[PDB]
Every structure is written in C-alpha cells, then in structure tokens.
Design a protein around this motif. Structure first.
Motif, PDB file in Angstrom:
ATOM      1  N   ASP A   1      26.789  14.933  63.965  1.00 36.28           N
ATOM      2  CA  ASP A   1      25.916  14.355  64.977  1.00 36.28           C
ATOM      3  C   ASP A   1      26.667  13.454  65.952  1.00 36.28           C
ATOM      4  N   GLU A   2      27.995  13.504  65.945  1.00 31.37           N
ATOM      5  CA  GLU A   2      28.832  12.727  66.847  1.00 31.37           C
ATOM      6  C   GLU A   2      29.779  13.662  67.584  1.00 31.37           C
ATOM      7  N   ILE A   3      29.838  13.521  68.911  1.00 31.17           N
ATOM      8  CA  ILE A   3      30.664  14.414  69.716  1.00 31.17           C
ATOM      9  C   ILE A   3      32.132  14.179  69.397  1.00 31.17           C
ATOM     10  N   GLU A   4      32.865  15.270  69.182  1.00 31.46           N
ATOM     11  CA  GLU A   4      34.262  15.217  68.772  1.00 31.46           C
ATOM     12  C   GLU A   4      35.219  15.217  69.959  1.00 31.46           C
ATOM     13  N   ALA A   5      35.010  16.111  70.924  1.00 31.46           N
ATOM     14  CA  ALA A   5      35.956  16.243  72.024  1.00 31.46           C
ATOM     15  C   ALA A   5      35.234  16.688  73.288  1.00 31.46           C
ATOM     16  N   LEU A   6      35.882  16.439  74.427  1.00 29.18           N
ATOM     17  CA  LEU A   6      35.343  16.760  75.742  1.00 29.18           C
ATOM     18  C   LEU A   6      36.464  17.278  76.633  1.00 29.18           C
ATOM     19  N   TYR A   7      36.175  18.328  77.403  1.00 28.37           N
ATOM     20  CA  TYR A   7      37.196  18.964  78.225  1.00 28.37           C
ATOM     21  C   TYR A   7      36.574  19.550  79.486  1.00 28.37           C
ATOM     22  N   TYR A   8      37.431  19.768  80.484  1.00 24.71           N
ATOM     23  CA  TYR A   8      37.082  20.482  81.705  1.00 24.71           C
ATOM     24  C   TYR A   8      37.613  21.906  81.595  1.00 24.71           C
ATOM     25  N   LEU A   9      36.720  22.889  81.687  1.00 30.01           N
ATOM     26  CA  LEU A   9      37.094  24.290  81.560  1.00 30.01           C
ATOM     27  C   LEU A   9      36.417  25.111  82.648  1.00 30.01           C
ATOM     28  N   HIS A  10      37.003  26.273  82.928  1.00 31.70           N
ATOM     29  CA  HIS A  10      36.434  27.189  83.901  1.00 31.70           C
ATOM     30  C   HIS A  10      35.086  27.714  83.403  1.00 31.70           C
ATOM     31  N   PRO A  11      34.126  27.936  84.312  1.00 36.12           N
ATOM     32  CA  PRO A  11      32.801  28.412  83.887  1.00 36.12           C
ATOM     33  C   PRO A  11      32.829  29.733  83.133  1.00 36.12           C
ATOM     34  N   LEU A  12      33.400  30.772  83.740  1.00 36.64           N
ATOM     35  CA  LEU A  12      33.346  32.114  83.174  1.00 36.64           C
ATOM     36  C   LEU A  12      34.543  32.459  82.297  1.00 36.64           C
ATOM     37  N   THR A  13      35.651  31.721  82.403  1.00 35.16           N
ATOM     38  CA  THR A  13      36.849  32.020  81.629  1.00 35.16           C
ATOM     39  C   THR A  13      37.305  30.891  80.717  1.00 35.16           C
ATOM     40  N   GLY A  14      36.816  29.672  80.911  1.00 29.43           N
ATOM     41  CA  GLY A  14      37.221  28.556  80.073  1.00 29.43           C
ATOM     42  C   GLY A  14      38.679  28.171  80.201  1.00 29.43           C
ATOM     43  N   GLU A  15      39.214  28.177  81.419  1.00 31.99           N
ATOM     44  CA  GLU A  15      40.605  27.802  81.632  1.00 31.99           C
ATOM     45  C   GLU A  15      40.775  26.294  81.489  1.00 31.99           C
TER      46      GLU A  15
END
Length: 339
Positions: free
Chosen positions: A221-235
DNA sequence: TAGTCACATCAGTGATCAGTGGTTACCACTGATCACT
C-alpha cells in the motif's frame, strides 16, 4: 503561486542597435515608476518578439503576451521558444486546428453545435501554460482574447490535486479516488490522453500538460518507485521523485469544490427558472433543465464533459458581474502583460 | 464580420468474428443345386 526561480536567458545573436537600445532603456526607466498605461509604437522587420524577449529577460516576471489571431501568435510563441529554450513558452487559447461554433445565428434561426479538432501538441501547449504557470516562474504564455475567458481558479489547480513522492504510504484505492477526482478516464489496452493504466503494482498516467507517460510502481500500500516513460513504448527518460500532478482540466475541483459547484448551480438554476417563468419561455426553460439535469449528476461521478466552461463560475465560487477567474489569476500580482 | 468557447456524446454508417446448423465394410449364414458314396 508556486513558482520556481527561473532566469530568462537569450542566445540569439540579435541585439538592439541604434534606436532600439535607447528605446528599450527609456521603456524600462518609464515602466519602473508604476504608470498603468504604456503605449509603444513599432513597425515590422524589427523583431517585435525579440523586443518582448529582451523586456522579459530584463524584467524577470511571468509574462502573458497577447495576439489577435493565429498566424501571429503561433510564430510569436515559436520565436520566444527559440530565444527562451530553458524557460517554458507555450500557446494557451489555441485548442484547435479547426473549429465550428456552438452558436446561434438569430437571423437564420440556426443553432450550430460545437465541433473541435484538438491537436495533441496544441492542447499540450495549453495545458503546459495552465500547469507550469503554477509550477515555475519563467513562463511566457501567448494567448488570444479568450485569455480573458473564465477558467477554473488556480488555487484549486495547485492545491486540490495530489502530489506523489517516493516512499509514501498512499493506498491504491486513494490513488484511484484522487485520479477519478482529477478528471481522468479508464483505458487499459491503449494509452490515450488522461487515462490510467492500472495493472497490479503498475499505474501509468498521461498528463494533459506532459504528453509523455508517468509510471508509479507500488510495493504493498506504499508506492515503491516513480519514473518518466514513453506512453506507447515505455522508454526510460530520467529519474524523478516528486510530482505535483495536475488534473486534465483547467477547472480543477476537489470534493468540497464539487459541493460548492453544485450549490451554485442549483441557486442559479432556480434564479434562471424564475426568470424564464416570468419571461414565458417554457420550451427554453425545459431545454435548459434537461441540459442541466444531464450536466449535474456526472460531475459528482467523474466531472469531465463539454460545456463545463458555461458553469465555470459555479466552480470558481465567484459572483455575477465579478471578473471571471482567468489566466490572470494564475499569474501573480507582479506579472507582466504584453499586447 | 471573423477568430473566440472541453480533451462529448451521438446514430447509425453498416465489414468481420463468433455463437451455432446441418451432414456421410474383408468376413459372415443361410440359400442351394448338383456337385459324391
């Protein structure tokens, strides 16, 4: 209100020469004294966008610049992006590559419905204006007359949404409740604008202001990680920790703001019903009541619809005749305006 | 008289996927007349 300290830096080799240095110097000396009316005369072929950029960089204020059409504001914004690349320069009013009014031609007695062709980059610039105005100080926003049209209050835009930072105990249920409270939709197989990919520990979002994707991976119930990724490819782009998310609308409203909007809608609906009863407009009052009946229930369900601007005052909590909450409220009391 | 208003629903308009729908014998025994004493 929240505005990170940004410095306007210009790399363009073009600089004032001859009359331009004296003109801009006198402009600054005679603007520093607080006179509310300032008239400049200027022809073409001299870089009006360049003069605006020079004034912006030697003033260091969040700037709203005003243009009367598209074939001026578009390239003006492009120029101010060129000589202000680090700072955020964007086009606000925009919202279309083509549009047809939902207007009423009285002479022909024709009620023409709204038609929109929303360009992704165009609305990206609009929501970038409405968001970065409340996230940084080095913001230049170009707009047409619709900048004086009433959006939602920036207060709600900046505090009635949610901020996520790594290693905080926020449940998935609360995250989904806040997502559906900040005007986002439910789409899984594809990734469209303003929808959440919810798959176990993974929640992926597309902000209206950033067309890219934001992914949060949970751990219990606690967020582990956060990232910026491409919408359709997750770059993978970079590593980010804190994100004060903004809703996909400029009419941001938390639950108590839904309560205020509902109460204002009800009171003005009663006033308009009385006015139409006195005017004898039975069919008109009926049409308004059916439209408002469809335009009350699903705001407290999700909120997003067409014509929410017509009830924008009810969201803002202001009164009749008072100046509508516009892009000016997003700017502070020390902002700069250019015409 | 023209660039302004939100990331919406229509009402089918009207090919394809997918529930269903139906469809196609070697022997072997008794039969048995003229094969036999």
């Amino acid at each position: 209100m929240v505005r990170a300290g940004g410095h306007f830096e210009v790399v363009s080799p073009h600089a004032p020469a001859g009359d331009q240095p004296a003109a801009i110097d006198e402009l600054e000396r005679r603007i520093n004294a607080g006179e509310r009316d300032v008239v400049l005369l200027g022809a073409t072929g001299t870089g009006k966008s360049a003069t605006t950029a020079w004034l912006i960089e030697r003033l260091q204020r969040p700037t709203l610049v005003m243009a009367p059409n598209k074939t001026l504001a578009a390239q003006l914004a492009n120029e101010l992006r060129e000589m202000l690349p680090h700072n955020a320069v964007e086009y606000f009013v925009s919202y279309y590559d083509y549009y047809q009014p939902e207007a009423y031609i009285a002479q022909t007695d024709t009620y023409i419905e709204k038609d929109s062709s929303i360009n992704d980059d165009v609305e990206r610039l609009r929501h970038s204006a409405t968001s970065a105005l409340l996230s940084r100080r080095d913001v230049v926003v170009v707009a047409s007359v619709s900048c004086i049209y009433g959006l939602g209050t920036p207060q709600s835009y900046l505090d009635r949404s949610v901020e996520l930072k790594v290693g905080e105990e926020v449940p998935r249920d609360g995250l989904l409740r806040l997502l559906v409270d900040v005007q986002y939709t439910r789409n899984d197989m594809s990734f469209t604008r303003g929808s959440f990919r919810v798959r176990g520990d993974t929640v992926e979002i597309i902000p209206s202001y950033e067309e890219l994707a934001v992914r949060i991976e949970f751990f219990g119930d606690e967020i582990e990680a956060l990232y910026y990724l491409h919408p359709l490819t997750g770059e993978v782009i970079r590593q980010v920790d804190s994100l004060r998310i903004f809703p996909a609308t400029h009419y941001v409203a938390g639950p108590e703001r839904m309560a205020h909007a509902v109460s204002a809608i009800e009171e003005e609906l009663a006033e308009r019903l009385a006015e139409l009863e006195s005017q004898g407009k039975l069919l008109e009052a009926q049409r308004l009541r059916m439209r408002t009946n469809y335009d009350i229930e699903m705001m407290r369900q999700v909120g997003f619809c067409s014509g929410i601007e017509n009830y924008s005052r009810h969201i803002d909590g202001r009164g009749p005749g008072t100046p509508p909450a516009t892009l000016l409220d997003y700017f502070p009391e020390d902002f700069l305006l250019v015409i």
